[PDB]
Design a binder for this molecule. Sequence first.
Ligand SMILES: [Zn+2]
Length: 114
Amino acid sequence: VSKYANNLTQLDNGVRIPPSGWKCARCDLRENLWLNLTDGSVLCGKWFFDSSGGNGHALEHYRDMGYPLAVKLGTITPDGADVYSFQEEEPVLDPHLAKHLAHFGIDMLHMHGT
Ligand SMILES: [Zn+2]
């Protein structure tokens, strides 16, 4: 569980999650994405060997905003999703996933949670 999730600061500043449901800033990846919990910056992170992209936008986001938390998009299930912390450096959980995703328009139950 993320310890930063307790003190999760969200920043609605032009946050507009795309009609694609997800896709990162830098590269053109449809998967392996990291949706920032704060301002809603969607980035990604390739799984070792990838031939589509996965550049270092995460560090840039730490340079720009400094918010080291993002949801691993694509792993979103009715139960929950995977989250990565750049601050804790670990794959972390969030006891407010549903709230955060719901505030993002991300409905886990939409496909098969109802
Ligand atoms: Zn990317």
